[PDB]
Amino acid sequence: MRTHSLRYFRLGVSDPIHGVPEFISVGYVDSHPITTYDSVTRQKEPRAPWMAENLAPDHWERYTQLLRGWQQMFKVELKRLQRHYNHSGSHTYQRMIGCELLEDGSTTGFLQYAYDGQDFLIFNKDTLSWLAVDNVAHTIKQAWEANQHELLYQKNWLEEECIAWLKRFLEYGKDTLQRTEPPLVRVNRKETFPGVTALFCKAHGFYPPEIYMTWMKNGEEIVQEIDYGDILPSGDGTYQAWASIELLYSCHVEHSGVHMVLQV
């Protein structure tokens, strides 16, 4: 099985300009949104039809109550952070928690906080400690580290709960998440600037988004400049990408255990 991940984000915004919610929380399985909540609706909602169909209303009800609490916590924490930094005006506080179930069956887990979009605190579940980026973060660290049981609870949640949630959601959405749509791949050739020929290897229509693409020279690796296009959502559930070089060339593509070679 391929690698899958479960991520929950939280975004807290101080004194938000007209429009932007004070608090937003969104969950993902891989690149797919699965749950949402914000301080305007004050309601937990599914963001995928396979979540909605497999979780009864009292689940949404229970997590509605939990997020309202987490919203309040996030608000207060942001106020204390602003005070520590002596900051006024509008600032942001973010949280990311989650886990990965790797191909080989091993796992990872992570829990991180950011302030104004920059790393602030990073949890190390193997020594049960928090990594602080500055003296303010260090203040919060000593507070969180003083609570031993709470450190253990978090390790348990990342290693066991998170993984069990992820397996549960993978099963709910398997027709979407475990499918394979192979790439359509083409090589385009063109003289650009006089004497300069550009080769583009372009792929589209593939799912999952993870794809490997490269250019080879005579079957061995190129030690020339390769430009890479981002992996971009095409809007229909599938993705597109490219790689290009200048001028025996061949484009190599790997996707979902299938290798492809396009010889120029």
Epitope: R68, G69, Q72, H149, E150, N156
Partner: antibody, heavy 109, light 114 residues
Framework: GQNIDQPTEMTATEGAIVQINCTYQ??????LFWYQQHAGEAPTFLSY??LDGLEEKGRFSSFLSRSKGYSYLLLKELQMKDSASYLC??????????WGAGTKLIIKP | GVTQTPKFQVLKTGQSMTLQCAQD?????MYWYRQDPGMGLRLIYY???????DKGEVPNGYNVSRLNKREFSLRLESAAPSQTSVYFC??????????????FGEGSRLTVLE
């Protein structure tokens, strides 16, 4: 989750040892609590476990095995004043507390 | 840290009744339990933080209001004999913390008679 089981009652002798078991079958696990409740009083928090192992606080120890869905509360050098109910409670996936019906501990002088 | 009243009350059926609970620990979550012989504590209503409340396991015949951060009231709408019980208020710092324990009030002994 669904179910927590701890004995209704246990009797042991002053000066000796008693082990109070609590098994749980829950949907998810986020920790197991023990509470002491003297007759006519409020429960007071005794212990929390969420990973495997044993924690000692004075004469009381709490043990957890996540693999077996099992905890015990261990009391050493029993005293009359340990006569009380001991309540086992597990937090499930959705952070709800599921309460066992308590074990009444009777101490023989 | 958790203050709860009254410790005793006799009620005639159909009487209404409010139980009060206050907590000065700046806890965010509060709870109302009833305790009956031969079963574990049962959650009536709870309040995950200021400004929200929700049904617990046995909400019927009751309702609550989270008045402010400190206080969580329990109401018996039309008192019934089956509501003869021992009521416990409790708070914790948050809800959906793993290790956060409950702190309990002294309890309220309620007897409802015809």
């Amino acid at each position: 989750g669904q179910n927590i089981d701890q004995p209704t009652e246990m009797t042991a002798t002053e000066g000796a040892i008693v082990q109070i078991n609590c098994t749980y079958q829950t949907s998810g696990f986020n920790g197991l609590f023990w509470y002491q409740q003297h007759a006519g009083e409020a429960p007071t928090f005794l212990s929390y476990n969420v990973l495997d192992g044993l924690e000692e606080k004075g004469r009381f120890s709490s043990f957890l095995s996540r693999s077996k869905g099992y905890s015990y509360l261990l009391l050493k050098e029993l005293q009359m004043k340990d006569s009380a109910s001991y309540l086992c409670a597990v937090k499930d996936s959705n952070y709800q507390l599921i309460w066992g019906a308590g074990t009444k501990l009777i101490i023989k002088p | 840290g958790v203050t709860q009243t009254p410790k005793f009350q006799v009620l005639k059926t159909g009487q209404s009744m409010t139980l009060q609970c206050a907590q000065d620990m700046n806890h965010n979550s509060m709870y109302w339990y009833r305790q009956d012989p031969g079963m574990g504590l049962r959650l009536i209503y709870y309040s995950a933080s200021e400004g929200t409340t929700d049904k617990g396991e046995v909400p019927n015949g009751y309702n609550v209001s989270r008045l402010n951060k400190r206080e969580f009231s329990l109401r018996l709408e039309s008192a019934a004999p089956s509501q003869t019980s021992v009521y416990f208020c409790a708070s914790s710092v948050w809800t959906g913390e793993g290790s956060g324990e409950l702190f309990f009030g002294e309890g309220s002994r309620l007897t409802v008679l015809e």
